[PDB]
Amino acid sequence: MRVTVSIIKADVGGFPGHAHVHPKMLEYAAAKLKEAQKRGVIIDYFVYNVGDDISLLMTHTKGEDNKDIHGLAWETFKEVTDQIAKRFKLYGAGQDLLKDAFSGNIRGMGPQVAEMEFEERPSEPIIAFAADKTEPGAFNLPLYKMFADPFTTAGLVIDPSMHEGFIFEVLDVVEHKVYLLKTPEDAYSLLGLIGTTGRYIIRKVFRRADGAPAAANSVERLSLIAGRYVGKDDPVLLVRAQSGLPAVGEVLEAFAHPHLVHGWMRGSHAGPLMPARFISVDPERRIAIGPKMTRFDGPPKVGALGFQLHEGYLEGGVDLFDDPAFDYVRQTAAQIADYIRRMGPFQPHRLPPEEMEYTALPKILAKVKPYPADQYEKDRKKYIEAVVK
Amino acid sequence: MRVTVSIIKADVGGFPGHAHVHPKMLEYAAAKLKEAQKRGVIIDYFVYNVGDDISLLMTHTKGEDNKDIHGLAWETFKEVTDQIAKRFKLYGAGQDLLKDAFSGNIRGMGPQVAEMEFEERPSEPIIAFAADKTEPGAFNLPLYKMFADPFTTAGLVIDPSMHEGFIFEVLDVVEHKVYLLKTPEDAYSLLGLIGTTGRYIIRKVFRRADGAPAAANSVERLSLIAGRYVGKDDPVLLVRAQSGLPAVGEVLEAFAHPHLVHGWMRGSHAGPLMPARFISVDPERRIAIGPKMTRFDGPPKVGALGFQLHEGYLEGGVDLFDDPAFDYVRQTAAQIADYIRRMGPFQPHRLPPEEMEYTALPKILAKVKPYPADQYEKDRKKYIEAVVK
Amino acid sequence: MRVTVSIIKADVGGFPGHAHVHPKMLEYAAAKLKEAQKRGVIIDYFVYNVGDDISLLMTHTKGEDNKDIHGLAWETFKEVTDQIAKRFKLYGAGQDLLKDAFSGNIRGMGPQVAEMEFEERPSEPIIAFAADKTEPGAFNLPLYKMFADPFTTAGLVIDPSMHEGFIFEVLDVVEHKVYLLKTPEDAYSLLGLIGTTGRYIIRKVFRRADGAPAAANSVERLSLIAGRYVGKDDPVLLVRAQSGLPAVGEVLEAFAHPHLVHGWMRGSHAGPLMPARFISVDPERRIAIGPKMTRFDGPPKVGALGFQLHEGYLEGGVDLFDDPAFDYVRQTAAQIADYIRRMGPFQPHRLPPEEMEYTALPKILAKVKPYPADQYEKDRKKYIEAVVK
Amino acid sequence: MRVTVSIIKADVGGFPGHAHVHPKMLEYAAAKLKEAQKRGVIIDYFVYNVGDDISLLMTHTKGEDNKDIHGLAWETFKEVTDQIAKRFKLYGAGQDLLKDAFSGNIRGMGPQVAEMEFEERPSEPIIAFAADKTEPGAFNLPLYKMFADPFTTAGLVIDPSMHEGFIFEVLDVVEHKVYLLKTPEDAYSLLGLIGTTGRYIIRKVFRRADGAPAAANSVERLSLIAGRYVGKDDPVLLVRAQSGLPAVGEVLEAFAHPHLVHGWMRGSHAGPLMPARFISVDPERRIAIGPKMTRFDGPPKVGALGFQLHEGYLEGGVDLFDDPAFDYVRQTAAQIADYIRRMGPFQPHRLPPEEMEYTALPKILAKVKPYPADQYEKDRKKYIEAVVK
Amino acid sequence: MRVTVSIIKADVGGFPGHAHVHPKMLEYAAAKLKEAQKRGVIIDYFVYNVGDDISLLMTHTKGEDNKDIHGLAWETFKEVTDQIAKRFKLYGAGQDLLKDAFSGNIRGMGPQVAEMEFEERPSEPIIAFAADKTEPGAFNLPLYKMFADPFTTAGLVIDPSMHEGFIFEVLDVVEHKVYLLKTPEDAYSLLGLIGTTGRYIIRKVFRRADGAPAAANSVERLSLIAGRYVGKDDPVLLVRAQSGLPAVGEVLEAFAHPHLVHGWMRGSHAGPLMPARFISVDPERRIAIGPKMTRFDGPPKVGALGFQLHEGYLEGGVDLFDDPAFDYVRQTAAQIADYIRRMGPFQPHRLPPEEMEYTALPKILAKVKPYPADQYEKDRKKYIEAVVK
Ligand SMILES: [Mg+2]
Ligand SMILES: [Mg+2]
Ligand SMILES: [Mg+2]
Ligand SMILES: [Mg+2]
Ligand SMILES: [Mg+2]
C-alpha cells in the first residue's frame, strides 16, 4: 500500500527560555493525535521534542501537502499553545504560529514540514531526525555525505544496486529557484551550491535508478511576516534506509563528525551539531523526551529515532545515537563548543552580518560618527586630540 | 550429573535495519522456552540479543547435536519470524532461516550453535558470549589469549593445575579439515593458522590434563545456499571457567584489548570489537536486552553473561563487561572506530576482495574497458588524448 | 628623538607554491637595506618571513607615509622579484606588486604597511607581528583583547595609568569610512563592528590618556586591480608595550587562544591562527626565517619578534612564542585544524560566498538549469522521471 | 622547454638491518650524479632516503623510459652496493638489484621508477614523496583524495579550472591490465578497484581538461625472479602542483590522516603511514637524510620534499611535513601503531595469506595432521583421548 | 672470521650525584681505547653512557672472558677514576671498582660484562643496550618477549627459520644455579622463574636450530664485598639480529611497553623503563652521550645503539629509539612515573624488604618497642593510656 510519512514540527513554547519543552505539551499532543487516529484521520503517530522544538510524526494515506494532515498539526500546536504554553506563561508561547488562520497548507506559516509518500516496502525502515538551535542547511553536510560520499556510505562503491547514485533537489531559498543535481557526475557543482548552507538547501533526495524518494528535509523559501523571516526555523528530516538506499548505519555515520552549523545562541553563531540521546523513549505512550539546550542555548543538537513501518503503523521509535561509539562524538562536540566559545562575538563563531537572526548594527551606525576615509587621513591628529581633550 | 549447555543463535529480524531486535521477539522466545521447560524438554534457558542477533541459551540432558534441542530452537526462530518479524515487517525478517524444513540438525541451516556436554562440577561457572557484526574468527584472538597467552592468563604460569596447557580444535572452513594443536609446544603453528581468521577458526578447546571441554565457538564449514555463504554468520561462544580452566577474570582479560575484527558494515570492513554492557538483564524473566549497533552498523560488539549451573539450572546471567575498567576499553574502541572510518573504502579498513560479503566488482569489470598493459604503454598518448577530446 | 617604525610586507614569490620563501630572497633584501642604512636612508632594519610573506621592518626619521621609505621597500621587492623569484620561477613571483610604476605611496599597490611615529621612550619595547594565510581582521580579536578585555590585560584593572582605556580607529574597508571608538564606554558598539572581521578592521589604536600611538595594523580600503581585490592581503602589525600600554606579556596573552580566522587554503576557509616559532633568528645578519605552511596551505600562523629601540636602532628580534606554554596553544591549534578540515567545502569552514577569494559559482550557475520554485512543485514528478529515464 | 623529472629508488643496504641507510651511501650517490651533471647527462639531482630506501631524483631532457637515465641510476646503485654496502657488510646489501646485467630499462629489475615529462610551466612546483615499509598501493588513498575528494581538495569545487576532474591510470598488477577512469563520473568504480591496494594501483594521473600529466606513482606488474616477487617494493611518487592541479597544501592534506597501509615488519602487516620530517636537508650538497624505522621495523613512514623547477634546475628540497600541525598527525600515528601492535599475528594487523611477503604455512601444513571434518566429528572423543593419553 | 663483541660497563663517577657522567670521562676512555686499537689489542670500540654508567663496547678476536680485554677495561676505568673522577671530586668516584688489584677476570669486581663470540655473518647487525638505575632482571621481560612472545616477534610464527625457538640460559643469582629452558615448550616454566626478576635472570640466549649465540645480558651471582652486594649493578645487553634471529625492529618492539623495573632512587623502588634517545652520537669520535637521570634519580632509562660489523669493525652506532613512535612510549613512561611516585614509600612502588638496596629497618627495630601480640591484647587500654598521659 502507499503510505505518507509526515513530520510537522514547531516551537510553541519553552521551559525555561529555549532550553526544553514542558512535558505536558507532549502529553497533550499525543492525546490529541490518539483521537485523530481513533477517527481514522491518521494511521499512527509519535510525538517528541529536541530542545524546545516539538515534532509530530504521523503516518496516513492522504498524500503530501494534505490540508487535513497540515490542519490537524496546526490545531494540535494551537491547542498546546492555548491550553499549556499560555497557561504556564512558557517562553515564546505560540512562537512559530505566525498567522491567525489556517489557509490549507502549514508551509510558510512558521512550522516545518518534511514528508514523503511511497509504496511501503517488504521492510520499510525509516529514521526521523530533529535538530534544535540550527537551520535546515545544517543537514546539508550529512545528506551529502550519506548519499554521495563514498567515505561515509560504503554501498556507493560495494553495492551494485547504489552504483547509479542519487538526485538532489536543492532549493535556493533567497531567489526561490530549484536545482536538480545528480551524483556522482554533478558532485562538485552540487557542493558549490550546498556549501552555502544558509541559501542553498537540500530539500529532497531521490534514488536515480527508479526515482524512489529517499529523504525529505524541512525547508521553505524565505518570506517576511511581522518582524520575522520564516523558512529556516530548526529543521526535521526523514530518511528511508536499506535495499538500494543507504543502510541505517551509513545514514548515522553521516552524523558521526559533529560539524559546525549556524544557529545556537540568538540564531547568530556557529557551533558543533552534537548527536544526542533522548532522555526517555516510551513506544507505548508514543512519546520521547529529547535533550535540553544549556550553555549558550545549545550547543545545537540532533536526535534520531528509527522506526519500522507495517501497513503504516510505526513500530519504534529507537534512539539511534545511543551507543558508546557516539559518546566519543559527543565528547568532541563538547570540547569544540568550549574552544569556539572563547571567540565571543567575532566571526566565524558569530555569523556573517547578512546571516544574523539578531542585530544591533542599526542602533550602532545611528550613534557612531563616520568620517570619510580620505578626509580622515588629513585630519587624524585633530580628530584624536579632540577625542583626548 | 552430566549436563549439556547449548547456545543457539540467529538473526531473524532487525529493528530498525540491523541496529537491534524488537523486544517482543525476546519475550516470545522466552515464553516459548518456558513451555518447553514445563514439558521437560530442557532444564533452564536465558534469552538475549546483542545487536540484531538473538541467542537462546538452554541447558538440558539430551547431549550435543540433539534433534529435539536443535528443533526446539528452529521452531522458536520460525515462530518469532512468523508472529513478530513478518507481522512488523522487520528488516531481514527470517534472514538466518535458510531452508524450508528442519532436517534433524540446525548446523548449516543458518543459525549458529555452540554447545558442550560435561559432568557438572562442584561449582560450574560458565560465560556465554555473543558478538554482532562479525565472524566466528573474531574470537580467535581472545580464545588464543585466554588459553595460551601467559600475559593474559596468569594461571598458565602460576597455577600447577594449568601447566600442561590446552588442545585446540581448529576448523578450516574452506577445505573442511580439522587440526588439533596443543599449547604450549604448538603455539607458533597454531598462530600460523588462526591468524587467518576468515579461514581457520578455533571451534573447541579442551583441557590437556584430562580432555575436559573448556570452550565451544560457533562455526561451520562454508556452504552455498541461494546467493548466500553460510558458516561465518555472527558467532556465539561458551567458556567454562576456574579450577584448572582460566578464571572468569582471565577469560574477560582476553577481551580487554578491543582488537580489529572482520564484519561491521555490509560484512565487508574491519573495526574494533567493543566489549559492551547489556541495556538490561532480568534474571527472573530470563531475558537480557543487549546493545544497539549505530554508526556504520556497529562498531562490532561482544556481550558477556556469566552463570553458575546447579543441576542444570542457570543462576544469572551477570553482565561481566559492567565495570569502569571496561569503560576505558570502550573509549579506546570508540576512538579507533572513528580513526579507521576515515579510511572509507580502502583496505585494510575494507576487507580483502575474497573476504568481502558485498561486491560490485562484477558490475565494474563489465563497464570499464581493460587494456593489455603491453600494448597500453605504446599507445598511452593516444588513449589519453582520446579520453580528453 | 622622534622615530618612525615601519613594516612593509609583500608576498613576491613562494617556495614551493605558497609554503615558504626562498632564503636568498631574505638575504638579498637584507643586503639591500644594509646599503640603504649605509647611505642614511634608514637607521636600522630586520628582514623576516612567516610563510611566503616577507616583512621589511625599518626604523628611520622620515615620518609615516614617506615616499622614500615606501619607495625603498617597493624597489627592494621589485629587485627580489627580478633577481631571485623570476630567476628561480618561484610560485606567484611578484604576486603582490600590482602596478608597473611607484606613485609616491606603496599603500593600495599590493604590499601591506603598518607604521607609527612617536617620541622614543626611556625604554621603547615594541613587538612586530606577521600572519600568513589570513586577512587583517584576523588581528581584530587579539587587538580588542590586549587593549580592552580585562580577562587578557590585567593592567586595565590594576594599573592606574591604563584606567582611562584606548581609542580604536576602525576602517570600514567596503564603504571607506573611519570610526573612532573609545573603550571601556564604547566596547559593545566597537564589537558590533569589528566582529565582522572582513569589513570593519582595527587599523590603529591610541592611548586615551594622551593620544600616544599604541598599535598599527596593516589594512587598506578595498580596490579592484586586474582580476584582484587589494586591501586585505596577509597582515603585519606593530604594537608598543609597557608603561601605560599593555605589558609585552598582555600583548602575547591576546594570542594565547588560537581563534578561527578567515584565509587558509585559496583565501576561502576558516581555521585556527597558530602562534608559531621562527625556524631561526639571526640578530647579527638582521634575518629571521619564519614557519612553513603545510596542510591545506596552513593552518594560518602568526609570528612575533620583540625589539628594544635605542636612538632608532633595533636590538632583537626575540621570538616571543618560543615557550612550552605556547606549545599547548599550538597543540590546540593543530587539533582544531584537523577537526574543522573534516567539514570539507561547507560553511562555516568554507567562507560566506561574498567573502570568498575563489569561486566557481559563475561556472555552476551557467551549467545547472534552475526551475522557478512555484512551477517546480506542480511538475516535480515529471522533472524527476525525466532525470531518471 | 620540455623537462623530464625522474625518481629512481632502491634499497641496496641497511644500517642496521632495515632501520636506515649509511650516510656514505648518499654522499657517494650524490658525487656520482654530480659527475653525470658535469658531463651533461642530467641537468640536476637530489639524493635522499626514507628508512633504508634511497631515492635518486634527477631532472634531464631525455624523456621517460630512457636507457641512459635508467642506466645511470643502475650504475649508481651498483657502485654504492660494491663500494659501500658490501664493504661495510650492510644488511640486504644490493637487495633490490635483481639481475646481473642492465637490459635498457630499470623497471622490473628491482628499483622503482616514477617519472613524468612535460613543458616546464611559468612556475613549476613539484613534490617528491618516498615511503618506506609499504607497497605502492599505500599511495592509492592519498592520490584519490588529492585528485578526487572534495573534502581534501577544495579546488575541485571552488576553482573553475579543476571542475572537469582527472584521469586515473590504474594498473592491475596481477593480470597486467590497465584501466582508465575519470572523476567525478567514475569515482565509485575507481574506488571499487583501488580499494584493493595490493592489486589495483594508481600509476599515473592526468588532468582531464588538457591531458597534462599530474602525478606518477612507481608500480610494475608482478613478476617472479629467484624466490622473489617484484613490482610492489616501497614506492616513490611525483606530483605537480598549482594552476589547475591541486595546490601544494591540498596535496599534503591528502596525507593528513595517517591511514593503515600494508607492509611494516616482514612486508606482512598493516600499520599507519606516518608523515615524517627529514633529519636534515642540505640543498647545497643535494642530500636529505630521512627518518629511521624503529619499532617493529616502522611504523611505515612517508617523507615529502617540495621543489621549484627552473630550466630543469631543482631549487629545494623543502621538507613539507615540518609543521606543528603535522605533529598531531604523527602523534595519532604513534598511538595507532601501539594500539594495533597489541593484535600480534592476527588479521587484519597481519595481512591476508595471499598478500603476505613471509610465510611458514608450507612448513606448518607439513607437520600438522589434518582430519577430514566429516570423519572427525564421528571420532572426536577418540582423537582427544589419543592426544591426552 | 670469528669475532668477539664485549661490552664492559661501570659507574666510576657521576656529575652531579648520579644524574649523568662528566664528558671528559668518555673522551679519556675513547683516547685510551684508540691506543689499544693502534697496538692491535682490539679491532674497534665505541664509548657511551646512559645516566652515570659508562659502557666500553669493544670488538676483538681474543674470545670471551679474556684477561687482556677485561684488564684493558679495568685499567681504562681505573685511569678515568684517577685522572678525571677524583680530580673533579665526582660523586661515587670509582664506585664500581671494588678490589684494589685485577685478578684475571673483571666479573665479580663491580663492572658488568656482556660478551659473545661468533662467526661474523655475511651481514652482522647487532644492538647494544645500556640501562641506568635498574638491575639486570630489567631485561628479563624484553628478552623473553623478543625471543618467545609471538605478539612481539612475528618471525616466530611467519618465518620458517625461527619456528624451532630459542634456548635461554637463566642464572639463579642467589643459589648460583643455571637453568636451560627452551621455548616454545618450556615457556611457562621459564616465566615461572624469570618473573622473579631479582633472582632468576636471563644471562644468554641461543638459537635452538644450531646453538648460535643470540644475546648476552650482564649478570653475576650475588657476592658480598665491603658493605656491598655485587652482581645486579645496572646492566648492559648485546643482541644479534636478523636471519633466523629477531629482526632489529622485533628486538626494539620488545621495549615498546615501558614496563615497571626495580631500581630508580636508592636502588629501592619500581618505576617505568623509559626507552630514551642519546643527546648526541659521534660515529667519528666513537662517542655517544646518553640521557640524564633527573626526577627521583630517573625514571630508569634504556638506550639502544645499532651497529653493522665488518671484519670486526663497528660501523655505527645508530640511536634506535629515535623515532616519533617512541615519543609516545616516553610520554607513557613520564606519566606512569608521575602516577607511581604519588605512592611515596609504600610497596609496590618501594621494593620488597629483601630486595631493597637501602634500609633503616635495623635502626627502627632498635628504637621501637615491640609487644608480644598476645599479651598486648589484654593490656591495650593500659598501653594507650600510657602513651597518652
Ligand atoms: Mg528551537
Ligand atoms: Mg547480526
Ligand atoms: Mg601569504
Ligand atoms: Mg625499504
Ligand atoms: Mg648507574
For residues A106 and A22, membership in a common domain is answered with yes
Expressed as residue numbers, the domain containing D181 is: 1-358
- Let me know whether C49 and C89 are in one domain: yes
Residues C161 and C276 in one domain: yes
Please give the C-alpha separations between residue C5 and each of A10, B341, C169, in angstroms, as whole numbers: 59, 52, 19
Closest chain E residue to the Cα of D300, Cα to Cα:
E325
CB C295 within 8 A of CB D253: yes
The answer to whether D257 and B342 are in contact (CB under 8 A) is: yes
C-alpha cell at E94: 670509582
* Site of grid cell 572426536: D380
Long-range contacts of E85-88 (CB under 8 A, 24+ apart): E85/E12, E85/E13, E85/E22, E85/E25, E88/E13, E88/E15, E88/E22
Q: Up-side HSE of residue D333: CA atoms within 13 Å toward CB?
A: 29
The CA distances from residue B311 to B120, B247, B285, in Å, are 7, 21, 20
DSSP single-letter state for residue A186: T
Whether the CA torsion A141, A144, A150, A154 is positive or negative: it is positive
Q: Considering only the beta carbons, identify the residue of B163, B165, B191 that sits closest to E157.
A: B191
Q: Looking at the structure, do residues E372 and E248 belong to the same domain, yes or no?
A: no
Q: Which helix (H) or strand (E) holds D301?
A: strand D301-310
E217: CA distance to ligand 5 center in Å? 16
Q: D366 and D335 in one domain?
A: no
Nine-digit cell string for C356: 570568498
Active-site residue A232, yes or no?
yes
Q: Say yes or no for a CB contact (<8 Å) between A192 and C361.
A: yes
The Å distance, Cα A191 to ligand 3 centre, comes to 26
The residues with which C272 forms a beta bridge, in sequence order, are C260
Cβ contact E110:E12 at 8 Å: no
A144, A156, A157: best to mutate for the D interface, most D CBs within 10 A: A157
* Residue tagged 587583517 (cell numbers): C136
Q: What are phi and psi of D361, to 5 degrees?
A: -50, -55
Q: Provide the 10 A C-beta neighbour count for residue E210.
A: 8
> Same domain for C88 and C134?
yes
The C-alpha cell of C174 is what?
Answer: 567596503
Domain check: are B10 and B114 in the same one? yes
Ligand number nearest CA of D92 is 4
Adjacent-strand bridge partners of D315: D308
Helix, strand, coil share (%) of chain A residues, nearest 5: 30, 30, 40
E345 and E366 in a common domain: no
Centroid of ligand 1 to alpha carbon of A53 (angstroms):
5
Q: Residue holding cell 585528485?
A: D147
Is E188:E170 a contact under the CB 8 Å cutoff? no
Number of domains in chain E: 2
Q: DSSP letter string over E86-139?
A: TTTT-BTTTTT--SSS--S--TTSS-EEEEEEEEPPSSEEEEEEEEESB-GGGG
At residue A33, the 3 state secondary structure works out as: helix
C-alpha cell read off for A97? 504560529
* Residue with grid cell 578540515, as numbered in its chain: C341
Per-residue 3-state assignment (H helix, E strand, C coil) for D93-127: CCCCCCCCCCCCCCCCCCCEEEEEEEECCCCEEEE
Question: Based on the domain organization, do E216 and E365 belong to the same domain?
Answer: no
Annotate C111-178 with DSSP letters as a single string: -EEEEEEEEPPSSEEEEEEEEESB-GGGGHHHHHHHHH-TTT-THHHH-GGGTT-EEEEEEETTTTEE
Indicate the burial class of E383 (C-beta count within 10 angstroms; 0-12, 13-18, 19 or more).
middle
Is B317 in the same domain as B389?
no
C-alpha cell belonging to residue D96: 633490490
Q: Are A43 and A272 in contact (CB under 8 A)?
A: no
B316 sits in the region (left: phi over 0; alpha: psi -120 to 50; else beta) called left
- Say whether residue D16 is in contact with chain A using an 8 A CB cutoff: no
Residue D48 cell numbers, joined = 635522499
Please calculate the CA angle D283-D288-D291 and round it to the nearest 5 degrees: 150
φ/ψ of residue D38, rounded to 5: -60, -40
Q: Give CA separation, A73 vs A12, A14, A26, D248, in Å.
A: 12, 18, 13, 54
Nearest to E163 among D269, D330, D360 (CB): D360
Are D165 and D183 within 8 A, CB to CB? yes
Cβ atoms of residues B184 and E188 within 8 Å: yes
**Prior bond of C317 cis (ω within 30°):** yes
Residue E18 annotated as binding? yes
Name which of D39, D22, D29 is nearest D8 in CA terms.
D29
d(CA E142, CA E202): 10
Which ranges in chain E belong to alpha helices (H)? Answer: 23-38, 67-80, 140-148, 155-158, 187-194, 248-253, 324-341, 361-365, 373-388
Measure the CA angle with vertex C208, ends C205 and C212; round to 5°: 60
Q: Rounded distance, CA D7 to CA D239, Å?
A: 11
Distance between CA atoms of B204 and B213, rounded to whole angstroms? 8
Looking up residue E375, the CATH number of its domain turns out to be 6.10.250.1180
Query: Which alpha helices (DSSP H) does chain C contain, by range?
Result: 23-38, 67-80, 140-148, 155-158, 187-194, 248-253, 324-341, 361-365, 373-388
E366 shares a domain with E220: no
Residues D331, E328 contacting (CB under 8 angstroms): yes
Q: Which contiguous run of DSSP H or E holds residue E308?
A: strand E301-310
Decide if D229 is catalytic: yes
In angstroms, what is the span from residue E122 Cα to ligand 4's centroid? 19
Annotated binding site of B for dihydroxyacetone phosphate: 18, 133, 266, 297
E232 marked ligand binding residue: yes
**Considering Cα of A102, then A108, then A114, then A118, what sign does the dihedral take?**
positive
* Residues C242 and C125 sit within 8 Å (Cβ to Cβ): yes
What are chain C's partners, defined as 3 or more CB pairs within 8 angstroms?
A: A, D
Size of interface B-E (CB pairs under 8 A): 40
**Rounded to an integer, what distance in angstroms lies between the CA atom of residue A138 and that of residue A53?**
15
Give the resolution to one decimal, in Å: 1.9
Neighbours of ion ligand 3 (CB under 5 A): C 11, 52-53, 132, 234
Q: Which residue of C has its CA nearest to A257?
A: C342
Range list of H helices, chain B: 23-38, 67-80, 140-148, 155-158, 187-194, 248-253, 324-341, 361-365, 373-388
Residues C91 and C232 in one domain: yes
Kindly state the cell numbers that stand for B132: 554482532
Place of cell 621597500: C73
d(CA C298, CA C133): 7
Structure determined by:
X-ray
Residues of B in contact with A151 (CB under 8 A): 341-345
| Neighbour count for residue D9 (Cβ, 10 Å) | 27
| Nearest residue to B17 (alpha-carbon basis) of C2, D334, A125 | A125
> What does DSSP assign to residue C194?
H
Nearest CA in chain D to B205: D384
Give the integer Cα–Cα distance in Å for C231 and C198: 11
CA distance D32 to chain B (A): 31
Q: Count other Cβ atoms within 10 Å, centred on residue A382.
A: 9
Q: Are E169 and E205 in contact (CB under 8 A)?
A: yes
Residue D44's nearest CA partner among D104, D122, D126, D150 is: D126
Q: Max CA-CA distance within chain C?
A: 82
- Chain A contact for B122 (CB, 8 A cutoff): no
- B contact residues 178-237, partner E, Cβ 8 Å cutoff: 183-189, 191-192, 195
DSSP letters spanning E191-241: HHHHTSTTTEEEEEEEETTT--EEEEE-----EEETTEEES-SSPEEEEE-
